[PDB]
């Protein structure tokens with residue numbers, strides 16, 4: 001997260017860190033046994049770390065659970081990142097409480113101007129890599145479709161939306177992928193891609209979760 005602030009320990013209880021010996025992507029807890037992340041974060045050997053704040057120190061509240069299976073969307077396209085969403089089933093259920101909680105799926109899509117909270121342990125520099133130890137937060141609005149398409153002509157599908165600042169300075173970045181974009185208490189987006197991080201006129205692009213709710217429900221119900 002570039003231009004963001006320290007969230008404060010456990011203030012984002014649905015945030016998870018996907019770990020393979022180091023933090024590589026974020027994710028969101030949607031129920032005690034399932035996490036939603038991005039398809040491009042897929043790899044085998046994923047350990048899901050819940051209740052984290054400093055990812056390099058065990059401070060208490062952490063629950064480390066291995067992924068039992070990861071389900072990448074069948075129509076995921078790695079070249080366009082269209083359908084960039086993945087579900088991870090946990091080997092055992094997590095204990096939910098005030099420090100570890102799930103986030104609700106949306107019932108409707110959000111409109112441009114909606115202010116959302118994006119969080120993650122991704123890079124904090126737009127020119128260089130500085131990865132943080134604690135969770136960072138950024139409040140960002142969803143942009144209109146014309147501004148998004150004018151910024152990325154021909155690369156935005158109906159399963160994506162842009163959120164951020166065209167002046168540059170505040171944005172999500174590598175390491176934040178797979179993480180949550182929460183608006184009015186509902187998970188509306190998944191950090192997916194962008195051109196560089198926090199560059200002017202190049203906002204972040206997110207997977208539009210309202211388009212996958214029946215897919216998530218049907219897939220969870222059959223697995």
Ligand SMILES: Cc1cc(Br)c([O-])c(-c2cc3cc(C(N)=[NH2+])ccc3[nH]2)c1
Nearest residue numbers: 172173174177192193194195196197204
């Ligand atoms: C080299 C590399 C590898 C992975 Br995996 C990423 O997710 C990314 C990445 C860049 C990137 C940029 C943004 C943004 N909002 N500007 C968001 C997610 C991103 N993810 C980059």
Ligand SMILES: [Ca+2]
Nearest residue numbers: 054055057058
């Ligand atoms: Ca920790």
Ligand SMILES: [Cl-]
Nearest residue numbers: 149153154155
């Ligand atoms: Cl276009």
